[PDB]
Design a protein around this ligand. Structure first.
Ligand SMILES: CC(=O)N[C@H]1[C@H]([C@H](O)[C@H](O)CO)O[C@@](O[C@H]2[C@@H](O)[C@@H](CO)O[C@@H](O[C@H]3[C@H](O)[C@@H](O)[C@@H](O)O[C@@H]3CO)[C@@H]2O)(C(=O)O)C[C@@H]1O
Length: 188
């Protein structure tokens, strides 16, 4: 199939700086045009207001990163390139929330522009259910020339580290194609 990264049974906690480093996998992510990032995780129950699930970030450019995050329980998403400009529409007020202290999944899909999808297509799903589609761009890691780091949890942006929380992660899976809504429903 299309599985390029699979990480199972890991966690963010005090002893690892609330972070699982996956930066060894950066080149795999840079190569992707259509992609899926899927994470099944359990946040500690009284979560921070903003925390990162999966991010790619840069040691030299503080405002160039990709993040699938949770903001006041809302599953959210943001990508910014080397000019700091937004790749996607705002997801901070997307409709679907996770429940902390319980198992949840969040799935992002990205489809590069095509003749019929002229600006590409991005989707975020929460527990198998489409939360919001964004048709601003189909930009992703290939569009971020200065990235250096990949992580679950606390995210290094230049000389600062932010968005840490304690998470149990049953799996992180990255695919080299965009799963369909039907596939997200069954494969989560
Ligand atoms: C998806 C999203 O909301 N991204 C925005 C983020 C996050 O809201 C934030 O990192 C979550 O904590 O915020 C961004 O803007 C931050 C940035 O401008 C820095 C500059 O130092 O300031 C942050 O606010 C500070 C505040 O100024 C501090 O004095 C103190 O109050 O804490 C906060 C830290 O949140 C901005 O939130 C970002 O780049 O991180 C803009 C993103 O679009």
């Amino acid at each position: 199939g299309a599985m390029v990264i699979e990480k199972e049974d890991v966690e963010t906690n005090a002893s690892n700086g609330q972070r699982v480093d996956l930066s060894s996998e950066l080149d795999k992510l840079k190569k992707l045009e259509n992609a899926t990032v899927h994470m099944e995780f359990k946040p500690d129950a009284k979560a921070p207001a903003f925390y990162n699930l999966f991010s790619v970030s840069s040691a030299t450019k503080k405002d160039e990163y990709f993040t699938m995050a949770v903001y006041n329980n809302t599953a959210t998403l943001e990508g910014r390139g080397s000019d700091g400009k937004q790749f996607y529409n705002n997801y901070n007020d997307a409709p679907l929330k996770v429940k902390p202290g319980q198992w949840n999944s969040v799935t992002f899909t990205v489809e590069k522009p095509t003749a019929e999808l002229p600006k590409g297509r991005v989707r975020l799903y929460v527990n198998g259910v489409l939360s919001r589609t964004s048709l601003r761009s189909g930009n992703f890691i290939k569009d971020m020339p200065d990235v250096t780091h990949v992580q679950i949890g606390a995210t290094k942006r230049a000389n600062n580290t932010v968005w840490g929380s304690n998470l149990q992660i049953r799996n992180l899976t990255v695919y080299n194609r965009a799963l369909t809504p039907e596939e997200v429903q069954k494969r989560s």
